[PDB]
């Protein structure tokens, strides 16, 4: 029944999707990233800022 039936009724046409697999969608892996942080910094205008 349910998902178990979908798992048990294994065929031939599905080997291309699940036989000798490389990935499990349900194993999260993330990369460690270089420490960085962002800041909004004001820059100023050289010359009049107008029309």
């Amino acid at each position: 029944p349910g998902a178990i039936s979908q798992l048990v009724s294994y065929g031939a046409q599905d080997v291309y999707l699940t036989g000798n697999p490389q990935i499990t969608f349900f194993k999260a892996v993330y990369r460690r990233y270089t420490n960085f942080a962002m800041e909004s910094i004001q820059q100023t205008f050289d010359g009049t800022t107008d029309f």
Partner: protein, 80 residues
């Protein structure tokens, strides 16, 4: 067999043009797309190494004049 054995080395000495050596500069790492391999350090695991590193840092600080202060006062000693 002196003349011969020395020449055998001489013949071989000439021949091995080239120089094999250990990989230079820096070694490199490969990054999984995020499925199918074990991380280098367990995420729970990473914090402990942080903690392990501290052992060394604190031990250095057991001698004030040898490094950096601690959380109070100070301590003296020396070697020999």
């Amino acid at each position: 067999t002196i003349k011969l054995m020395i020449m055998l080395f001489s013949y071989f000495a000439a021949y091995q043009l080239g120089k094999m050596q250990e990989r230079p500069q820096s070694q490199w790492p490969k990054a999984k797309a995020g499925q199918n391999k074990y991380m280098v350090g367990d995420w729970a695991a990473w914090k402990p190494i942080y903690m392990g590193v501290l052992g060394v840092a604190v031990l250095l600080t057991l001698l004030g004049p040898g490094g950096v202060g601690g959380g109070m006062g100070g301590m003296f000693g020396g070697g020999g």
